[PDB]
Structures are given as C-alpha cells and as structure tokens.
Ligand SMILES: NC(=O)c1ccc[n+]([C@@H]2O[C@H](COP(=O)([O-])OP(=O)(O)OC[C@H]3O[C@@H](n4cnc5c(N)ncnc54)[C@H](OP(=O)(O)O)[C@@H]3O)[C@@H](O)[C@H]2O)c1
Ligand SMILES: NC(=O)c1ccc[n+]([C@@H]2O[C@H](COP(=O)([O-])OP(=O)(O)OC[C@H]3O[C@@H](n4cnc5c(N)ncnc54)[C@H](OP(=O)(O)O)[C@@H]3O)[C@@H](O)[C@H]2O)c1
Ligand SMILES: NC(=O)c1ccc[n+]([C@@H]2O[C@H](COP(=O)([O-])OP(=O)(O)OC[C@H]3O[C@@H](n4cnc5c(N)ncnc54)[C@H](OP(=O)(O)O)[C@@H]3O)[C@@H](O)[C@H]2O)c1
C-alpha cells in the first residue's frame with residue numbers, strides 16, 4: 001500500500017511542486033487549497049491520469065477562528081477517508097503581506113497571518129498525531145532574523161512556526177513522528193512584486209544571483225520525508241543560496 | 249516632568265518588581281492587571297504614598313479576540329490620561345500552562361497563550377508607536393525557547409513569536425527613535441502551583457548558584473535597557489538565566 | 498569520468514562510513530588518515546576490489562603548525578595526482594578530549610584548534626585554489642551551544658568551524674562551490690567512554706533513545722553533495738534525534 | 746579596598762574607553778598594549794593623576810605561539826603585583842584584516858587572527874581562574890553570522906570566542922565567576938578605512954544612521970561587571986543599533 005501525504009496550499013507555486021514531487025516519489029496526496037479551486041482540481045486530474053486513485057482535493061480557509069480546529073481535523077480526515085492512512089503532513093499554506101506598526105482590520109490581519117503560518121500548522125499537527133516513516137515538514141523562512149520591513153505579523157507567524165517545529169519534534173519523538181522544516185530565502189517571487197524589485201532580490205543571492213526554483217525547495221522536503229533522514233528531527237534546513245549570510 | 253511607563257501584569261511577582269524599580273528610578277507607572285485587582289490597587293497605594301499621583305491601575309484581558317486591539321489602545325490611552333505621556337512599555341503579562349498535542353477548549357488555549365505572549369505585545373506596540381526623549385519597549389521573553397518544556401507548544405510558539413516582534417519592531421521603529429529589546433529569564437520566581445520538591449529539581453540545574461533568579465534581578469536588566477546606558481541597543485535580547493540555557497540534557 | 502572526493506579521518510568510524518557511501522554513489526576517494534594506517538589501507542583495498550583504481554590513501558598530521566598549510570595543500574594535491582580532479586571535500590578528522598580551565602597547553606591548542614578549525618580552513622583554501630557539482634561538507638556539532646563540561650578548546654574549534662562554513666559559503670559561491678555542515682548529536686560514541694556513560698547519553702535522545710549510526714550521518718553528507726542540494730549553501734543540517742532540544 | 750581590572754588592547758579606541766569607564770567607576774586598571782606604548786603610558790599617566798597608583802601598563806604580543814601561555818600568565822600576574830587582586834578581565838585586543846580563500850604568510854595570519862581573538866582570551870581565562878564580584882567580558886561581533894567578505898580567519902576567531910564565552914560560563918560558574926560578551930556592530934571604524942566607505946556603513950544602521958561611540962560600547966561592559974548583572978552569565982549583548990537585523 002502506497003503512503004499518503006497532506007500538502008496545504010498545494011494548488012500553486014511551491015506547494016504544487018511539493019505535491020507533484022511527493023506524487024512522483026510514490027505518495028498519494030491530499031491537495032488542500034483555499035481560493036485556487038480550478039488549479040487544485042486541474043492538479044488532481046493530472047496526478048490521477050498518471051496513477052489512478054492517487055490524488056484528491058480539500059478546500060479550507062486556514063485563517064484563525066472558532067471553527068479552525070474543526071477545519072484542520074477535516075483536512076486530516078480527508079486523507080484517511082480517501083487513502084486509509086496519513087504518513088506525511090506538509091504545512092506550506094501562508095498569508096504574506098505587510099502590516100505596518102504606524103481595507104482589512106488589524107484583527108483580520110492577525111487571524112490570517114498568525115492563523116495560516118502558525119495556529120493552523122499546530123492544529124493540523126495535533127490532528128495528525130491523534131489519528132495515528134511518519135513525518136511533518138513545515139515551510140519556514142531563512143530570513144526570519146533579518147525580516148522584511150513592515151512585515152511584523154508575518155515574521156511573528158514564521159517565528160512561531162519554528163517554535164512548533166522544535167516543540168512538536170520533542171513531544172512526538174516517542175511516537176516515531178519526526179518534525180522538520182525547510183526554510184527558503186527567495187524562491188518563486190510573489191506575483192504582485194514588480195520586475196525591478198524582483199531583479200534586486202535576485203542580485204543579492206550569492207549562489208548564481210537567481211531565485212530557487214519551486215523544485216529545488218521540494219527536493220529538501222523529499223529528503224526530510226525519506227529514509228535517508230530517519231534520525232533527523234527538530235531540524236530546519238535552509239535552501240537559500242547563501243542569502244541569509246549576506247550583510248546589509 | 250517625569251517620564252511614564254506601562255507595565256503589563258504588574259500586580260505581582262516579576263511585573264511588580266519591574267514597576268517598583270521603574271518607580272524608584274523616577275517613572276510614573278501604569279500598573280496593568282487582569283484578575284489581581286486587590287494586589288494592583290495595593291501596589292499603586294504604596295507607590296503613591298512615596299510620591300503623590302505617580303501610579304494608577306488599568307484592568308484588561310489580553311486574551312486574543314476581535315476587541316483586543318481596542319483593549320490595547322485603551323491601556324496606552326490610560327497612560328496618557330494619567331500622565332500626559334508614555335515613554336516606556338514593558339510587555340510582561342503572560343499565560344503559562346501545558347497544551348499536549350496528544351476545562352479549556354483548544355480555541356481558548358490558543359487565544360490565551362498566543363494572545364498574552366505575542367498578539368497583545370504587538371497591538372500594544374502598535375498603539376504605543378502610533379501615539380508618539382528616551383522611548384523604548386522591553387518584552388519579557390524566555391531563555392529556554394529552543395529547549396522547551398514538554399507539552400508547552402502553544403506557550404513556546406507565543407514566546408518565539410515575541411522574539412520575532414522584538415526584532416521586527418526594533419527594525420521598523422528605529423527611525424522614530426523607539427528602541428525595542430527583550431529580557432529572557434530562565435528560572436526566576438517558580439510557579440505558586442509548583443511543589444517544593446519540583447522547585448528544588450529546577451534550582452539544582454542552574455550553574456550560577458543553584459538557585460532561581462529573584463524578581464529584582466530580572467527587573468535590573470529591564471532598568472538597564474530603558475536607561476541612557478543602552479541608547480545604541482535595539483533588537484537585543486539579554487538572557488538572565490544563571491547559565492541554565494547552556495546545560496545539555 | 499567519475500568525480501573524486503577527499504575525506505579526512507576516513508580510516509574509521511563516521512569518516513569510514515562517509516568514504517564508503519561516497520564510493521557506492523560512484524566517487525573515487527582519497528582516504529586520509531593520521532595514525533590508522535592498517536585500517537586505511539584495508540578500506541582502500543576493499544573499495545578497489547569493488548572498482549579498480551578508485552581509492553588511494555594519504556597520511557597527514559593535521560595538528561596546527563607552520564607546515565600545516567603545506568600538509569593541507571598536499572592532501573588536495575594527492576587527489577589531483579590520483580584522479581585528475583577534486584570535486585568534494587569532507588572535513589571529518591577531529592581531536593576530542595577535555596581541557597579544564599582550572600600534554601602541554603600549547604599541544605592541546607594545536608591539536609584541538611588545528612584539527613577542528615584551522616586544517617578545514619587550509620584545506621578549503623587549497624581546494625578552491627586548485628579549481629560541475631563542487632562542494633565542501635564540514636562535520637560540526639549539534640550541541641555546540643550546550644557544550645560538554647571542561648571541553649572549552651574542542652568547543653571553540655567547532656564554533657570556529659561554523660564560522661568557516663558560513664564565511665566560505667559566502668566567498669566561494671561565485672566559483673560554484675557550495676559549503677555546508679552536518680552536525681551529529683551523539684553518533685558512534687567514544688571508544689574510551691564507559692558503558693554506563695554511553696547508556697546515560699542514549700537515554701537522553703528523544704527519537705529512539707539511541708545514538709545515530711555512522712551510516713545515518715553519512716546519509717546527510719550524501720544529500721548535501723548531490724544534485725538535490727544545488728541551491729543549498731551555508732546550511733548546517735542537524736542529525737541528532739532531537740537531542741539538542743532537551744533541557745537540563 | 747577597590748577592585749582591579751585587566752583590559753587587553755586598552756591604549757586606543759574601544760579598549761581605552763572601557764579602561765576609562767572602569768577607572769571612573771572605581772576600578773584600578775592594568776592597561777595592556779602591544780605596539781602603542783606612548784598611548785598606553787599616557788593613558789596610565791592620566792588615570793594616575795586622578796587617583797594615585799591606580800593604573801599600570803603591561804605589554805604583550807597575543808599572537809599564537811609557544812610562549813603565549815606564559816605571556817597570558819604574566820598579564821594576570823601583573824594585576825596581582827600592582828593591586829593584589831584581579832576581579833575583572835576584559836578580552837578586547839584583536840587583529841582584524843582580510844584573508845582571502847583564493848606579505849604575511851598564511852600561518853602567520855592564522856597565528857595573529859586566531860591568537861588575538863580566541864586563543865589568548867582562552868589562556869587569559871585559564872590564568873585568571875587559576876589565580877582566584879568576579880567576571881570576564883569578551884568583545885564579540887554582532888555580525889558574526891553575516892560576515893565580511895574575505896574575513897574567514899577573523900570570523901572563525903570571533904565564533905571561537907562565542908564558544909569560549911559559553912564554555913567558560915558553564916565551567917567557572919561554581920567558582921562564582923561570570924563570563925559574558927559585548928557584541929558591537931559598527932563602532933569606531935578602522936583607521937585605514939576611507940571616509941566614503943565609512944559613510945556607507947553608517948548609512949546602514951537603523952538607529953540613528955551612525956556608528957556606536959566607544960563610550961556606548963563601554964556602557965554595556967560596565968553593566969555586565971556591575972551588581973545589576975549578578976545572575977547574568979553566558980550572555981552576549983549586542984550593541985549594534987539594529988545593524989544585524991538588516992537584510993542584504
Ligand atoms: N516564495 C518564497 O520566495 C518564499 C520565501 C520564504 C518562505 N516561503 C514559504 O514557503 C511556502 C510556500 O511559498 P509560496 O510563495 O509558494 O506561497 P504563497 O504562494 O504565497 O501561498 C501558498 C498558498 O497559501 C494558501 N493560502 C493563503 N492564505 C490562506 C488562507 N487564509 N487559508 C488557507 N490557505 C491559504 C494559498 O492558497 P490558494 O491559492 O488556494 O488561495 C496559496 O496558494 C510558504 O509557507 C512561504 O511562507 C516562500
Ligand atoms: N517566572 C519565571 O521563572 C519565568 C521564566 C521565563 C520567562 N518568564 C517570563 O517573565 C514574565 C513574568 O513572569 P512571571 O512568572 O512573573 O509571570 P506570571 O506570574 O505567570 O504572570 C504575570 C501576570 O500575567 C497576567 N496575565 C495572565 N493571563 C492574562 C490575561 N489573559 N490577560 C491579561 N493578563 C494576564 C496575570 O495578571 P493577573 O494576576 O492580574 O491576573 C499575571 O499576574 C512573563 O512574560 C514570563 O513568561 C518568567
Ligand atoms: N561521534 C560522535 O557522536 C560525534 C558527535 C558530534 C560531532 N562529531 C563529529 O563528527 C566527526 C566524526 O566523528 P568520529 O567520532 O568518527 O571522530 P573520531 O573517531 O574521534 O576522529 C576521527 C579521526 O580523526 C583523526 N584525527 C585525530 N587527530 C588528528 C590529527 N591530529 N591529525 C589528523 N587526523 C586526526 C583520526 O585519524 P587516525 O585514526 O588515522 O589517527 C580519527 O580516526 C568529527 O568531526 C566529530 O567532531 C561526532
């Protein structure tokens with residue numbers, strides 16, 4: 001029987017690449033999405049065409065709220081209902097936008113940024129553990145200690161996610177569930193970012209003066225879920241081409 | 249005119265010590281509290297007896313909710329109402345209890361632990377800056393954030409988020425001349441719930457003296473960070489832990 | 498043509514497993530050693546029996562001295578002499594013993610700082626100057642911020658090795674040379690260490706209550722030298738079973 | 746009776762400001778220097794004019810060598826000769842120049858850079874501890890994880906110094922000796938640096954767009970040796986105006 005993985009925010013960009021690469025490795029996949037329904041269903045079609053009965057979708061808002069615990073239970077449930085098991089959880093989904101200290105209300109910003117980046121990962125981890133080569137991989141940020149100007153809530157969420165990776169590694173080790181992170185620097189640049197700013201970020205990266213492909217990020221996720229990482233838990237692997245080493 | 253400080257969770261223990269030492273240095277203080285009304289009022293009485301009209305109390309629940317931004321704005325408002333200015337914010341209030349992964353609901357646990365330790369400090373920082381000398385903010389962190397207590401995931405997540413706020417806020421508020429720093433205890437005043445046997449277990453782990461930090465020793469680090477001797481220090485988190493975080497399992 | 502690797506301290510234990518795993522992956526290997534001549538020759542014999550003309554030995558003392566730079570240049574030379582190329586350097590050799598603050602101290606400094614830091618630096622210099630998929634892997638220590646009592650000089654050396662890893666990753670990026678680290682917690686325990694003390698350490702590891710095999714450490718080295726880690730540089734991967742996360 | 750402090754590299758710049766503030770606080774001081782004899786003697790003259798026989802000078806090369814242990818012993822010896830006691834050690838003296846990976850020989854660069862920044866502090870720590878509000882303060886570097894291009898040996902030394910700070914804090918705690926660090930970002934910029942290049946660094950600092958005065962660095966040292974830091978050991982306080990927080 002093939003193992004099964006849940007990947008949050010898997011319809012596009014890095015989540016999509018992780019889902020595809022896990023599928024190619026032999027996993028059956030739950031494609032979670034929020035708004036990108038067409039992309040999600042298109043991915044499931046592609047993967048099922050490759051191997052029958054190996055991909056499904058699950059929609060959920062991962063903003064923090066009174067119903068989030070139930071929403072996270074249902075995402076994990078969807079893996080069990082379709083595939084009868086859940087071996088891997090990849091916390092990839094993420095809100096990312098500025099929240100200056102000095103449109104959306106501040107309480108909504110808190111809910112979205114801390115919800116997607118930290119609280120949802122915690123609730124999904126809870127549900128994943130309770131329902132049991134098991135492992136969880138959290139998508140972190142290599143630049144968390146040199147944060148983007150005016151992104152305090154996003155940065156707080158990513159710091160919180162490091163805490164979860166370590167706390168969960170410690171607590172779930174007795175159950176044989178490993179918990180690790182992968183920390184991109186710059187990978188697929190945000191859709192809205194202008195071409196001039198995109199070029200400025202590329203020119204800062206020591207290794208090749210370009211961004212990581214989504215596949216290069218997925219390669220690190222594949223390593224951490226594999227048998228070659230069976231003693232690795234609580235580790236966060238930077239995949240940033242030396243960007244975080246570069247001073248102001 | 250004397251400067252003014254807000255200290256959250258100041259009715260007892262480390263918060264009280266910070267409030268007292270700030271007062272003794274020359275600050276007027278807002279003593280924020282949640283449930284400890286009698287203690288807060290008693291402290292304000294003691295400080296006002298030393299110097300008239302230099303201490304007030306301010307009640308607020310810092311659990312996460314849609315009104316938390318309003319509550320945080322109001323704590324800063326209260327400092328301006330009493331003293332006409334607000335120079336120092338100390339984020340000390342904290343919920344602390346285990347939340348195992350495997351009669352509070354998980355929603356409540358998230359709201360209290362992430363609210364008190366991270367979101368409230370963020371909203372108080374927003375309101376503090378929005379209203380703006382020697383201005384600074386001090387966040388009470390945790391020296392053991394990378395070697396966390398078993399089954400304290402949400403608390404640990406909160407304190408990690410607080411490190412992020414400290415760095416992010418230091419970067420962003422530097423242009424306004426507001427410094428943002430942290431003080432990170434190891435073991436200080438042990439919980440009142442904890443039994444004496446278990447307290448001794450923790451004391452025995454500390455390289456420097458085999459004892460916990462007094463509240464005053466923690467307050468000493470806060471006073472340094474707010475002082476003129478720390479004018480170029482921002483984004484720094486000073487451990488005050490007697491070497492505890494250096495000890496392997 | 499097969500690529501070539503230098504592994505320092507490769508006669509025994511973790512170094513041996515790295516050399517063997519690199520060889521199985523297809524590398525030709527220089528097996529460096531200091532005192533373990535018989536074990537080093539035996540390894541080279543076994544690898545050459547598998548694939549003729551794919552292994553040689555190279556003896557060198559890596560204690561700090563005024564001739565250490567020449568010794569390190571000669572190790573890199575030996576790879577080129579044998580195989581006409583040098584693609585991978587693994588800095589594994591290490592002196593490990595206590596040096597209480599309260600053998601001469603000159604010797605202790607020369608051995609502990611030389612093997613763990615200065616020799617890696619000089620080998621990195623020689624490797625770079627002689628220059629695809631080029632990279633360097635440094636054997637670090639996951640417990641570097643929770644040090645063993647009375648091991649100041651060892652700890653200083655391993656801290657220095659982190660600094661080298663980061664500094665060299667930055668400077669050598671424009672030459673396409675990646676520089677990374679693998680940081681064991683407890684793996685193969687010291688030969689001198691008593692059985693009660695070994696059991697004490699094993700019981701502290703969250704993930705399985707046992708030390709890592711030398712093979713589990715080699716697995717992370719292999720990941721870092723591979724095409725799956727092409728955007729990874731300046732990264733140190735802990736392989737410690739969660740040991741570094743455990744408070745006193 | 747008044748306490749006594751040894752400050753290495755105390756003739757000029759940051760070391761001088763530290764010696765002055767320690768003296769103003771009530772300490773008697775050993776002013777250590779290497780080449781700057783005129784400045785050292787003139788500083789002692791100034792302090793002795795304030796309070797009779799409260800300052801002495803002590804010359805020593807802190808480059809790594811066979812005689813360095815003896816030399817460090819004699820620096821501590823000189824404090825006891827002059828003042829009958831040694832309460833505080835400040836490791837401030839430092840070599841700082843580039844050492845690219847691709848007329849000094851490399852062995853000499855190793856000796857100077859690793860000697861001044863790491864090995865000498867270690868030997869002075871040994872001698873200080875052996876001879877016993879006692880504390881040691883090590884001058885570190887806030888930018889140690891975002892290092893200057895082509896400064897590998899300097900960076901390795903400063904990393905090693907973090908290792909010493911932590912290892913010695915642990916080991917010397919039972920004797921009541923605290924061991925901490927102060928980590929400037931940019932303070933007094935090097936004399937050899939051109940004013941255009943100095944201006945570029947100043948413009949990078951979030952808090953005030955300028956470098957730290959030597960006195961601001963001295964302020965953190967005074968805090969760490971005071972009674973207001975009695976429970977603080979193994980801590981490194983950045984004094985960098987937010988510089989280490991700024992991405993590339
Ligand atoms: N891209 C980079 O250079 C970079 C750098 C550092 C870290 N990372 C991290 O790597 C991961 C992947 O990065 P990325 O750039 O691919 O991410 P992304 O495109 O910005 O977002 C990934 C997905 O998150 C989902 N999402 C957003 N808000 C949500 C919500 N409220 N509820 C549920 N799902 C929500 C979205 O799903 P729908 O489209 O279906 O709405 C989105 O497609 C993220 O965790 C990110 O923080 C990326
Ligand atoms: N004590 C230690 O050994 C230690 C170790 C590491 C870090 N720290 C940190 O240092 C700081 C002080 O420690 P402590 O032990 O003195 O703290 P504490 O007694 O556990 O808590 C301090 C105050 O936080 C307030 N608080 C709790 N929940 C609240 C809520 N929902 N809304 C508003 N206020 C709330 C309480 O106010 P009321 O009493 O008025 O209800 C309480 O008196 C904390 O941030 C803590 O995390 C302490
Ligand atoms: N083992 C662990 O649990 C552990 C934990 C943390 C980090 N590490 C790191 O992982 C690496 C491998 O560990 P290990 O336990 O396998 O190492 P090890 O057995 O202690 O040492 C490996 C080799 O280093 C060589 N060596 C010692 N002094 C030398 C010198 N002066 N000049 C040249 N070579 C010298 C020796 O070669 P010869 O026998 O030929 O003389 C020895 O076989 C080391 O870097 C170590 O620090 C290991």
Ligand SMILES: NC(=O)c1ccc[n+]([C@@H]2O[C@H](COP(=O)([O-])OP(=O)(O)OC[C@H]3O[C@@H](n4cnc5c(N)ncnc54)[C@H](OP(=O)(O)O)[C@@H]3O)[C@@H](O)[C@H]2O)c1
Nearest residue numbers: 754758759778779780781806807808837838839884931932
């Ligand atoms: N300045 C900054 O922006 C900055 C930034 C980060 C860290 N730091 C650290 O803070 C400390 C003070 O900085 P600084 O700029 O004031 O230092 P510095 O001027 O570069 O050096 C201080 C002294 O070190 C002594 N020294 C150099 N080589 C020596 C040797 N081989 N043996 C004995 N002494 C030697 C010299 O003494 P003589 O003059 O008598 O020969 C020199 O005056 C240093 O540890 C430095 O690394 C400074």
Ligand SMILES: N#Cc1c(-c2ccccc2)[nH]c2nc(N)[nH]c(=O)c12
Nearest residue numbers: 094095096141143185186188189190
């Ligand atoms: N670029 C970028 C992103 C970064 C980022 C990029 C550079 C430095 C720090 C963060 N984080 C992101 N998170 C999400 N969810 N989506 C993104 O596009 C990014």
Ligand SMILES: N#Cc1c(-c2ccccc2)[nH]c2nc(N)[nH]c(=O)c12
Nearest residue numbers: 342343344390392434435437438439
């Ligand atoms: N002891 C303890 C505490 C700790 C703590 C103590 C030891 C290691 C890690 C954390 N954190 C606390 N936070 C609050 N709010 N109150 C406490 O009492 C503590």
Ligand SMILES: N#Cc1c(-c2ccccc2)[nH]c2nc(N)[nH]c(=O)c12
Nearest residue numbers: 591592593638640645682683686687
């Ligand atoms: N155990 C162990 C070792 C450790 C070590 C193990 C646990 C904590 C800190 C260090 N480091 C070593 N280095 C070498 N060269 N050889 C060893 O065996 C070890």
Ligand SMILES: N#Cc1c(-c2ccccc2)[nH]c2nc(N)[nH]c(=O)c12
Nearest residue numbers: 839840841888893930931933934935
């Ligand atoms: N500028 C600067 C220095 C720095 C430095 C400044 C900024 C970033 C990294 C290092 N370190 C120094 N060490 C010594 N001994 N002397 C110096 O002048 C500096």
